[PDB]
Design a protein around this ligand. Structure first.
Ligand SMILES: Nc1ncnc2c1ncn2[C@@H]1O[C@H](CO)[C@@H](O)[C@H]1O
Ligand SMILES: Nc1ncnc2c1ncn2[C@@H]1O[C@H](CO)[C@@H](O)[C@H]1O
Ligand SMILES: [Zn+2]
Ligand SMILES: [Zn+2]
Ligand SMILES: [Zn+2]
Ligand SMILES: [Zn+2]
Lengths: 565, 565
């Protein structure tokens, strides 16, 4: 064996973010709105870095698809096009690759020309996905063999996505070890794992599995960063990269590249003849525009910097190694212009039709049986809760706050654009696994905030759960009268205080906003298994209409609220 | 690809049976004692068949070691010698390969020149077993590649044998699929699995895992046979071989070769260009001597057939395709003669010394506090129970019947031969996982048989369990007064009716003999997880003395029995 060097360049979890998106940083001491990401910047940066560095290896760690209308309106073809233009060496399957079933994955893979790897996701012969990817590949650098193994997250995909029954999944840790062990006798001592298992599982693999040198990560969406990125108050979770020892005592490196086309990770690796990795270069490149630099003025308005203040802002960004400004790729620009124009036409098409009476929503209807409201209150909120309930086969009930719906939902045609109009906040679906007693408590919390302590927008409505409550609390301080949960037997049953339910809600109240105290306490406590699904609210609404293209409006809100009189 | 044929020749679970052993068959209508097996016959038959057939593949499916003094007195060197003389192509690790720790396995592997395979048993770098075997091998027949993958049983090895902590084990099904899946892209469509997982798990693999054509089995000790062997009333469990379809619809063949050097399995396989297996020859060869043909006469004595009756017996055996008479190999005969002579010397060596007072046993001492007995009864039986308790780290308590010990155990030197004198019945250790209430019941059963319904030899004594009982049953028909089990905290605690204990006993009473009704009912009911460990009783006694080379005799039997007066 001889020593060799590799230049790993990687992204993950772009989730159909073909265009840039807004974020906030602390620049020269002030909170500043800026634009980051987009696939034109990704491809431009990959193209420039791969020509600059010896032995580049260009990787995508999964969840190419789902998250914007660029997926929904094109079935993956837009994502395939921009990925092809980046000339990635390998792509591994994520969890969202299965969101539209085997059928949906096939539609991505057909136009995609990037080699696909996944060692623990294995289709049977009759599957439409048979022979569409391989478990590993071996490439040669300066005479040396290097293996790369693909890997997906298991439970999350099986439970929260929609793979077909003819696709078999295998344990992440076992697959990683068995794959690496088999490669040894082929004279291979340099092994890369391209894994959508998430940071937590990949860190476990690093510490429990031998013979794997680098684990390029997706699924967790973590920014692995450095002091430069910390100085901008970006959400840095870990240093780029993390380092462990495996049971044999050899170093293992683990790193992710944030999400949503925001970062190109850049890791230079030298391997000893015996295949031990060391780091020669480590840069998480944040892709940023120079054109939006907005700060909040004294009237509360976000305004562009001007004059010397703008110059100082630009100078600071230009001086940073980990910020890359205004990268753009001509080919990718052409593709995105084409898809953007098509998207604007397609988004005006009808996804479904609603018949019947208007479903009351907005501020006036937040609380049932109040002046200016109606006896059912915000039926539109129940509707939104139903769109959330429809996402996951595993979910027992969902809860949505009335303030998350800004107007009545009226009968007539519903377009893709309309869904984004109905739901302007950009929430994703978030789940907890929680006892019935806590479900009762969060409803109590929300009603208390809505009626007494805060905004009426906190008032809760659910799908798969229905309740009666009094405005006036009883002797024990409780407003709830009855709570039922739908047996997914299809009969309504009394909630069970001791049963652990899988509960879905929006990301906003999941963190405890709007007085949802109970959710606030469950957040980050692993006992409750909290997870951000990254399924956007407007997209959930679109799926619901696709399922009910001729939907008869609900006439009840799953809430009976006895107002004080 | 081209079509190719393979001639698989295999044994399994020889368990150090270098010499023939006795069995009983139904020959010409009469029960007949005959000798079968031995490694001279194995090697002779393998040698003759491999020269007769094209493309022979000669395999050993594990548990080469443990079961006779040929292991104990030689540490595996005798087994290695006879295996080497058979020129096997591959050996896979079984469960008993770890009975004497990594240290014991190393002693087998050092002299062993047969390539070793095991894909789901993987030593860490610092292990003394590092790099002593490979997960798979690829060989070429007439230009075609065929892969062979090794596999071991997991839970049984980890729990009931003694592998070191630096040896990691992986799931049988996952390993089989991941290994086979990885081999595909190397242009391999013919795959053999050499698996000590046992028949049950191998049958599951055949039905749940793709891309594996033949599974050559060890661990279960099942005779896979045919109508010829059924006619002799041999213990045929399945047809040689079994056939399944995998999830992809392709055929999979599974077969074992009984145990204890008794059978050479002979399976001719043709593979299509696409790697689909079909059977061209299927013979389970039972290796039998022509020299012992004994039937029971009218005085109850076993006597050799003579004259025309002997001739008819021989003629019947000679006419059978699946019986092979008097195979012997010159080289192996020389090895066995050498080891047999050495064994006779070594077996007279001292394994331990007992000091103190005689431990009463035999018929006179079966029941405590009876005429001709002593207040403690059969302390020697408690001793034997302790030797059983010492075998498995997992076992909570053991129970031994007093009739299983034929004499007092006196102070002084104990040799290897002495252990086989102490314990002449040839039992192995058998376990059940059973509730405390059933433990109470089996003690009640045994006492009832000993005192009223049958032989006094049924009277039970235990290790890790102690009890008080009255000869006269109470109003509820029960003799037990108290039952305690040793917390493995090292404090005695009351038995818990609802706790499931791992209970060890001998194979004889495990089947319900001697009135052990409760064990009889647990037998073959999978709820109770019954398993024959194949750990022989005399060998357990030898291990105990090795652990206590200067053992002070027990003075109590773990039983307080209040005789009726
Ligand atoms: N991200 C969000 N998701 C749902 N509701 C929101 C969000 N942001 C604000 N609201 C609602 O709007 C109100 C503030 O106008 C809040 O009380 C809340 O009910
Ligand atoms: N295989 C055996 N294991 C233990 N005890 C046995 C066995 N065979 C016979 N005995 C004992 O010997 C008695 C018959 O003499 C039985 O009642 C039983 O107690
Ligand atoms: Zn993602
Ligand atoms: Zn993901
Ligand atoms: Zn065995
Ligand atoms: Zn075994």
């Amino acid at each position: 064996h001889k020593a060799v060097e590799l230049s790993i360049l990687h992204i993950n979890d772009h989730h159909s973010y073909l265009e840039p998106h807004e974020t906030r940083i602390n620049l020269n001491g002030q909170q500043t709105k800026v634009d980051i990401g987009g696939f034109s910047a990704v491809n431009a940066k990959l193209n420039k870095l791969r020509k600059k560095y010896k032995n580049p290896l260009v990787l995508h760690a999964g969840d190419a698809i789902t998250g914007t209308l660029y997926f929904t309106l094109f079935g993956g073809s837009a994502d395939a096009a921009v990925m092809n233009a980046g000339n990635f060496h390998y792509f591994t399957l994520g969890n969202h690759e299965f969101d539209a079933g085997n059928e949906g994955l096939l539609k991505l893979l057909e136009p995609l020309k990037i080699p696909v790897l996944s060692a623990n996701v294995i289709p049977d012969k009759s599957s439409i996905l048979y022979n569409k990817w391989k478990p590993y590949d071996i490439f040669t650098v300066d005479g040396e063999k290097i293996a790369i193994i693909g890997l997906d997250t298991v439970n999350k995909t099986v439970n929260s996505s929609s793979p077909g029954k003819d696709v078999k999944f295998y344990d992440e840790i076992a697959t990683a070890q068995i794959m690496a062990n088999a490669l040894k006798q082929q004279g291979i001592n340099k092994i890369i794992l391209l894994s959508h298992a998430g940071s937590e599982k990949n860190i476990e693999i690093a510490q429990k599995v031998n013979d794997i040198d680098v684990i390029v990560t997706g699924d967790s969406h973590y920014l692995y960063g450095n002091d430069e990125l910390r100085s901008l108050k970006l959400p840095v979770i870990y240093e780029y990269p993390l380092e462990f020892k495996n049971p044999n005592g050899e170093p293992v490196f683990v790193m992710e590249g944030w999400a949503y086309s925001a970062v190109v990770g850049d890791l230079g690796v030298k391997f000893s003849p015996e295949g031990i990795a060391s780091i020669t270069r480590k840069i998480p490149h944040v892709l940023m525009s120079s054109h939006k630099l907005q700060v909040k003025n004294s009237e509360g308005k976000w305004a562009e910097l001007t004059g010397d203040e703008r110059k100082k802002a630009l100078d600071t960004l230009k001086s940073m190694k980990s910020i890359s400004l205004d990268d753009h790729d001509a080919k990718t620009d052409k593709l995105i212009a084409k898809y953007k124009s098509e998207k604007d036409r397609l988004a005006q098409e009808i996804v479904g039709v609603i018949t019947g009476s208007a479903m009351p929503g907005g501020s006036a209807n937040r609380i049932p049986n109040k002046a200016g409201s109606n006896p059912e209150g915000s039926i539109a909120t129940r509707f939104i809760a139903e769109t959330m309930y429809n996402e996951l086969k595993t979910v027992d009930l969902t809860i949505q706050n009335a303030g998350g719906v800004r107007a009545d939902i009226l009968p007539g045609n519903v377009t893709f654009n309309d869904a984004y109009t109905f739901l302007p906040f950009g929430n994703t679906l978030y789940t907890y696994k929680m006892e019935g007693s806590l479900v009762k408590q969060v409803l109590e919390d929300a009603m208390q905030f809505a009626l007494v302590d805060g905004s009426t927008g906190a008032f809760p409505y659910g799908a798969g759960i229905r309740y009666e409550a009094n405005e006036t609390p009883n002797a024990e301080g409780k407003r709830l009268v009855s709570v039922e949960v739908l047996n997914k037997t299809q009969q309504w049953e009394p909630i069970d205080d001791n049963k652990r339910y899988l509960v879905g809600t929006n990301a906003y109240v999941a963190g405890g906003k709007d007085g949802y105290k109970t959710f606030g306490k469950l957040f980050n406590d692993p006992k409750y298994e909290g997870v951000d699904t990254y399924l956007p609210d407007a997209e959930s609404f679109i799926k619901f209409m696709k399922k009910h293209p001729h939907f008869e409006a609900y006439t009840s809100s799953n809430v009976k609220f006895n107002a004080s009189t």
